[PDB]
């Protein structure tokens, strides 16, 4: 009677309890207290209610779904996935997540505390999957929201090492969906060939979604995998902090990016990356602009550590038939980034910043401006010819560089022939320090290679900190690049032996609102006159020069050339020196040529 009730499932509901024997505390039953927590064990049972042990040959999916569905029905809670066990998933979910190749459906206010391990069984080999899906509809546009869903703990999600079956397939760990106040904290995602580990939001719908203190380990493994971004941030007021990302496959060096920031007010901070092609995309895709507008603004990449093989930050924006995307108000700061040991040209072109074309290769759709790149370090090994502070491959409406340290082959680069970007407001402050690792490697190359259609309202203040006499020039403009309302200077330090410092193939430095200064060697010849006497340049290509001054000592006693020069209508320089004794003088002098500065 009483014995029977006690051994029944209702037994615990008949045993009284009062907290610490406190007479002022609730008189409850044991079952009530045990009902304050919930684990997968409370649903991991056969139809008669007997517990099932997890393992390689047990598909845990329906049991976890039942737990989620039930806790959802009570307004939420946290389900623990117990430590000490590996819980295998072995079949697809059903309903609104089947269109997403979903395994488990997440539900609002239902948190998962993953302390044990979740493993994918070989049912998923060569197939698509998205392990945790927060959509409730096959069509994301008719999906409801996922709110207040947190996954956390010390546990693991293991994708079982299976390769993709076909490049067209997609694979994900956590697809939060149209997600609001959702997060992943503490979890290790490992051992896969996937497209993403976590995606946050859906085409701008969502808010307040975060990935923190997670580890992502070896999540690309095959030539079949088309592309990878480990965390894809597709809702605003969201981001990634204090994570670790590591890949070891060769394929990852060519296709994988750690983070993609695709909506406004998003961030990527304090994370360490190794073995990836790319650091972060920061891109406003017009096809993803439904939920939070057409502008990506307030984008922050800060205080990360990366060894990569391709590009650290990739900026973009694009358009559709009905929507134009814009990118502005970005800060990239405090990051320390290297291109890993590799042969030149063996992975995508190495870059700290890349201004990339759209997915169809168009370089004339972008609207990127008000970007600040400051207080970062970049290094590439001396053999990596394809390394640049910025590869400027598409139209740019502004990017400002202050107080960085760049130590790679090029400072500014774009390939000739290719795209001919239209450039406005590119600012390279004199406080950017140009390293010398690539000294002596730059035969035939221009340090700032300005292979653009045009440059306007831009500043390039070149300052070397060691010699590199192998380079063709410090900065070169082809004749095809228009240049106006710009300031281009080359500091003389470490330049005395350079044949070419600044080169303007179309004589663009003569423009009315071009402000330039650079060293040049000039031959001069004086009149015979004893006393104050003019010296004039033998060459006539200085009609643009507003002043020039001596960078050379005067080895002579009997005369001195002018310290300073102006020009004449015929393009000669002229200055007044001094003949202590008369005679025609002929000298070769290093001058700082200046125009309007």
Binding-site residues for Ca(2+) sit at 99
C-beta of 225 vs 425, nearer to a copy of itself: 425
Q: Quick check: 546 binds a copy of itself (CB under 8 A)?
A: yes
C-beta of 160 vs 511, nearer to Na ion: 511
Among 108, 169, 218, 425, binds a copy of itself (CB under 8 A): 425
Among 528, 570, 586, 588, binds a copy of itself (CB under 8 A): 570
Strand (E) or helix (H) holding 88: strand 86-89
C-beta of 277 vs 427, nearer to a copy of itself: 427
Q: Quick check: 127 binds a copy of itself (CB under 8 A)?
A: no
C-beta of 145 vs 419, nearer to a copy of itself: 145
Interface with a copy of itself by CB under 8 A: which range of 100-108, 128-136, 171-179, 572-580? Answer: 572-580
Q: Choose from Na ion, a copy of itself, none: what does 453 bind? Cβ within 5-8 Å by kind.
A: Na ion
Among 141, 287, 466, 479, binds a copy of itself (CB under 8 A): 466
Instruction: Report DSSP state, residue 299.
Output: E
Question: Which residues are known binding-site members?
Answer: 99
Q: How far apart are CA 449 and CA 316, in angstroms?
A: 21
Residues 323-342 that bind a copy of itself (CB under 8 A): 329-331, 333-334, 336, 338
C-beta of 171 vs 595, nearer to a copy of itself: 595
CA distances from 572 to 106, 536, 537, 547 (A): 78, 6, 5, 12
In the complex, the smallest distance separating the C-beta of residue 13 from a copy of itself, rounded to whole angstroms, is 7
CA dihedral 495, 498, 499, 505 (to 10 degrees): -60
Q: Quick check: 59 binds a copy of itself (CB under 8 A)?
A: no
Q: How far apart are CA 455 and CA 450, in angstroms?
A: 9
Among 346, 465, 470, 588, binds a copy of itself (CB under 8 A): 465
Interface with a copy of itself by CB under 8 A: which range of 100-108, 251-259, 428-436, 499-507? Answer: 428-436
Among 290, 560, 582, 583, binds a copy of itself (CB under 8 A): 560
Q: Quick check: 54 binds a copy of itself (CB under 8 A)?
A: no
Q: Choose from Na ion, a copy of itself, none: what does 352 bind? Cβ within 5-8 Å by kind.
A: none
Nearest CA to 551 out of 475, 495, 467, 488 is that of 495
Q: Choose from a copy of itself, Na ion, none: what does 377 bind? Cβ within 5-8 Å by kind.
A: a copy of itself
Q: Quick check: 574 binds a copy of itself (CB under 8 A)?
A: yes
Site mask, a copy of itself, residues 133-172, x = CB under 8 A? Answer: ---------------x-x---x------------------
DSSP 148-210: EEEEESS-EEE-TTPPPSSTT--EEEEE--SEEEEEEES-EEES---S-SEEE-BTTBEEEEE
DSSP 49-70: S-B---STT---HHHHHHHHHH
In the complex, the smallest distance separating the C-beta of residue 441 from a copy of itself, rounded to whole angstroms, is 16
Tokens of residue 422, six digits: 């239209």
C-beta of 353 vs 363, nearer to a copy of itself: 353
Q: Quick check: 292 binds a copy of itself (CB under 8 A)?
A: no
Q: How far apart are CA 406 and CA 339, in angstroms?
A: 12
Point out which residues bind Na ion (CB under 5 A). Answer: 453, 480, 482
**In 3-state terms, what secondary structure has residue 283?**
strand
Q: Choose from a copy of itself, Na ion, none: what does 500 bind? Cβ within 5-8 Å by kind.
A: none
DSSP 90-153: -S---STTGGGTEEEE--TTEEEEE-SEEEE-GGGTTS-EEEEE--SSSSGGG---EEEEEEES
Q: How far apart are CA 124 and CA 333, in angstroms?
A: 41
Q: How far apart are CA 63 and CA 505, in angstroms?
A: 72
In the complex, the smallest distance separating the C-beta of residue 506 from Na ion, rounded to whole angstroms, is 9
CB 79 within 8 A of CB 38: yes
Q: Quick check: 553 binds a copy of itself (CB under 8 A)?
A: yes
Site mask, a copy of itself, residues 297-326, x = CB under 8 A? Answer: xx-x-xx-x-x-------------------
Beta strand pairing status for 368-374 and 486-490?
unpaired
Which 3-state string (H, E, C) describes 358-381? Answer: CCCCCCCCCCEEEEEEECCEEECC
Site mask, a copy of itself, residues 488-517, x = CB under 8 A? Answer: ---xxxx-x----------------x-x--
CB atoms closer than 10 angstroms to residue 23:
6
Q: How far apart are CA 244 and CA 258, in angstroms?
A: 9
Q: How far apart are CA 183 and CA 199, in angstroms?
A: 10
Among 6, 94, 126, 584, binds a copy of itself (CB under 8 A): 6
């Amino acid at each position: 009677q009483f014995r029977a009730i006690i051994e029944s499932p209702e037994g615990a509901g008949h045993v009284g309890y009062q907290y610490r024997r406190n007479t002022g505390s609730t008189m409850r039953m044991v079952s009530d207290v045990l009902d304050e927590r919930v684990s997968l064990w409370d649903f991991h049972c056969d139809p008669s209610g007997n517990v099932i042990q997890p393992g390689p040959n047990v598909d845990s999916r329906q049991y976890l779904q039942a737990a989620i569905d039930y806790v959802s029905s009570n307004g939420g809670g946290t389900i623990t996935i117990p430590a000490g066990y590996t819980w295998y998933l072995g079949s697809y979910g059903v309903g609104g997540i089947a269109g997403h190749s979903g395994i488990i459906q997440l539900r609002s206010n239902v948190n998962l505390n993953i302390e044990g391990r979740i493993h994918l069984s070989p049912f998923f080999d060569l197939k698509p999957f998205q392990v945790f899906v927060g959509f409730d509809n096959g069509d994301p546009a008719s999906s409801g929201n996922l709110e207040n869903c947190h996954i956390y703990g010390h546990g693991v999600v293991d994708f079982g090492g299976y390769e993709f079956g076909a490049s067209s397939q997609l694979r994900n760990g956590v697809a939060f969906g149209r997600s609001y106040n959702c997060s992943v904290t503490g979890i290790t995602f490992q051992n896969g060939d996937v497209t993403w580990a976590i995606t946050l939001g859906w085409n701008g719908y969502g808010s307040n979604c975060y990935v923190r203190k997670c580890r992502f380990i070896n999540l690309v493994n095959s030539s079949v995998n088309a592309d990878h971004s480990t965390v894809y941030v597709n809702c605003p007021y969201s981001g990634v902090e204090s994570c670790y990302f590591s890949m070891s496959s060769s394929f990852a060096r060519n296709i994988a990016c750690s983070v993609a920031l695709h909506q406004h007010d998003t961030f990527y901070r304090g994370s360490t990356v190794n073995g990836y092609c790319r650091g972060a995309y920061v891109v406003m895709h017009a096809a993803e602009a439904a939920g939070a507008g057409s502008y990506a603004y307030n984008m922050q990449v800060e205080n990360n550590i990366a060894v990569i093989y391709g590009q650290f930050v990739i900026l973009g924006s694009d358009v559709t038939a009905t929507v134009s995307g814009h990118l502005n108000d970005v800060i990239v700061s405090g990051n320390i980034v290297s291109i890993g040991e590799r042969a030149a040209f063996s992975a995508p072109f190495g870059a700290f910043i890349d201004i990339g074309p759209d997915n169809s290769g168009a370089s004339n759709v972008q609207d990127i401006q008000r970007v600040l790149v400051t207080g970062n370090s970049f290094y590439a090994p001396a053999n990596i010819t394809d390394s640049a502070a910025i590869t400027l491959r598409a139209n740019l409406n502004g990017c400002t560089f202050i107080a960085n340290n760049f130590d790679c082959r090029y400072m500014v680069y774009n390939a000739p022939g290719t795209t001919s970007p239209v450039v406005q407001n590119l600012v390279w402050d004199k406080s950017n320090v140009i390293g010398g690792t690539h000294a002596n490697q730059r035969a035939g190359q221009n340090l700032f290679d300005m292979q653009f259609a045009s440059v306007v309202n831009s500043t390039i203040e070149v300052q070397l900190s060691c010699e590199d006499l192998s380079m063709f020039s410090c900065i070169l403009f082809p004749a095809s690049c228009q240049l106006s309302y710009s300031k281009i200077t080359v500091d003389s330090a470490w330049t005395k032996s350079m044949s070419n410092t600044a080169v303007f193939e179309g004589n663009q430095q003569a423009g009315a609102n071009v402000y330039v200064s650079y060293p040049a060697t000039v031959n001069l010849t004086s009149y015979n006159t004893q006393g104050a006497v003019p010296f004039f340049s033998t060459d006539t290509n200085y009609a643009w020069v507003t002043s020039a001054y001596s960078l050379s000592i005067n080895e002579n006693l009997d005369f001195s050339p002018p310290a300073t020069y102006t020009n004449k209508a015929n393009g000669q320089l002229v200055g007044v020196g001094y003949n202590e004794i008369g005679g025609v003088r002929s000298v070769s002098v290093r001058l700082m040529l200046q125009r309007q500065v």
